[PDB]
């Protein structure tokens, strides 16, 4: 299902560069989807924040999620 996860990320890849901003990565779960928890979103930022530079290359993030 990793190809489906990557294709779901590729919807929000408006840059076509393989990286997505933490603003859009918070806004996708925050404003849309099923629901959003503030502590879970902040813990998601804490888990994905091995870099913490405002942009995440999601290709390694898919492998860390699976």
């Amino acid at each position: 299902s990793e190809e489906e996860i990557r294709e779901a990320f590729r919807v929000f890849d408006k840059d076509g560069n393989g990286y997505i901003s933490a603003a859009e990565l918070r806004h996708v779960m925050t404003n849309l989807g099923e629901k959003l928890t503030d502590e879970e979103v902040d813990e998601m930022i804490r888990e994905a924040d091995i870099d913490g530079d405002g942009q995440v290359n999601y290709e390694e993030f898919v492998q860390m999620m699976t």
């Binding site: 299902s1 489906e4 996860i5 919807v11 929000f12 989807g33 099923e34 879970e40 813990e43 998601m44």
Partner: protein, 359 residues
């Protein structure tokens, strides 16, 4: 040129088609008035039943004068069109029998030759007035602009339309369906109800007049057929069969009209295609987020080593990626149809581009 005279004769035929229709309708109306006056009035009103009966004869003599004057305009139009100089050549043999068949049918009024029943004789002559209703398609065809323009007759002779009554039928039915199909059935209900009331009178207990047949005719026309009133006479049953046949034909006409009026044209297809295009992208984003939330939450509850509260999110993850693949494959075939609509004219322009590009 003679094309100014040829168009000039087609306003003298339009007026002679209209005023003949007026003098036929005013004969039919006086026939109905006489048939009802002889029923509600009896033998006491023997003066007015002579006065109206001879007014009908005056009106039908004027009608027999307004048809010879029409066919003279047609034979002058034939001489002007094909370039003749003698009318004896221009007249045909079958046409001169059509003249006689037209003058006989337009001359079957009940004349003043000599309790409220018409009698076996004049009740058929009174209903033979309704055979004048061939004067209305001629007048409708002449009032329409397709015959009344030689610039239209040129494209008709390029197409061999040949001035059919059926082309203006298709024309008025494709342009104004509901006005025509609403006026026609009400006219059929009133005319056929009156003819059935003539066929079934029943002076004892008044059980045949319009208070019964105005209920019996639409119930037959729509093929309901309760059966509380039925036709009783042999002539009533012919009228109630010819009402049901026209009811089946008008239902078969209404089905085709309503079937044409439901499809989209080009321009409504475009705005439908845009309303779907702004709507599938919302779900393309929403279901993507629904994948991405559970995609992390299942890994979270897996790394937290709670295997009971992780299987539910794995179940929702499978459901969400199933829904996402459905909405993505649904989204791409819409835009395939968007690319399919602009195929032909863009290739017709690109051919003209690549033709000039070869030099």
């Amino acid at each position: 040129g003679a094309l100014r005279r040829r168009k000039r004769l087609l306003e003298q035929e339009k007026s002679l088609a209209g005023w003949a229709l007026v003098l036929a309708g005013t004969g039919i109306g006086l026939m109905v008035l006489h048939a009802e006056m002889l029923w509600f009035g009896g033998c006491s009103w023997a003066l007015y039943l002579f006065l109206v009966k001879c007014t009908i004869s005056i009106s039908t003599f004027l009608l027999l004068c307004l048809i010879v004057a029409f066919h003279a305009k047609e034979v002058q139009l034939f001489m002007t069109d094909n370039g003749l100089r003698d009318w004896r050549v221009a007249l045909t043999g079958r046409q001169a029998a059509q003249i006689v068949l037209e003058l006989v049918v337009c001359g079957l009024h009940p004349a003043p030759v000599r309790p409220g029943f018409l009698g076996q004789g004049e009740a058929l002559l009174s209903l033979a007035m309704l055979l004048r209703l061939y004067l209305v398609p001629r007048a409708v065809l002449l009032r329409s602009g397709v015959l009344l323009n030689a610039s239209y007759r040129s494209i008709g002779a390029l197409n061999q339309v040949r001035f059919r009554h059926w082309f203006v039928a298709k024309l008025y039915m494709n342009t104004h369906p509901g006005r025509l199909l609403l006026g026609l059935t009400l006219g059929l209900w009133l005319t056929t109800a009156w003819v059935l009331s003539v066929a079934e009178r029943q002076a004892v207990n008044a059980t045949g007049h319009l208070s019964d047949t105005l209920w019996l005719i639409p119930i037959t026309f729509l093929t309901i057929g309760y059966g509380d009133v039925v036709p009783g006479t042999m002539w009533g049953k012919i009228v109630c069969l010819c009402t049901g046949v026209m009811g089946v034909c008008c239902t078969a006409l209404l089905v085709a009209v309503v079937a044409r009026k439901l499809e989209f044209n080009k321009a409504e297809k475009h705005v439908h295609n845009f309303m779907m295009d702004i709507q599938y992208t919302k779900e393309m984003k929403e279901s993507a987020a629904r994948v991405l939330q559970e995609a992390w939450m299942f890994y979270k509850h897996t790394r937290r080593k709670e295997s009971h509260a992780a299987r539910r999110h794995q179940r929702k993850l499978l459901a969400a990626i199933n829904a996402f693949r459905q909405v993505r494959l649904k989204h791409r075939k819409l835009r395939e149809q968007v690319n399919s609509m602009v195929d032909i004219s863009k290739m017709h322009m690109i051919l003209y581009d690549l033709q000039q590009n070869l030099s």
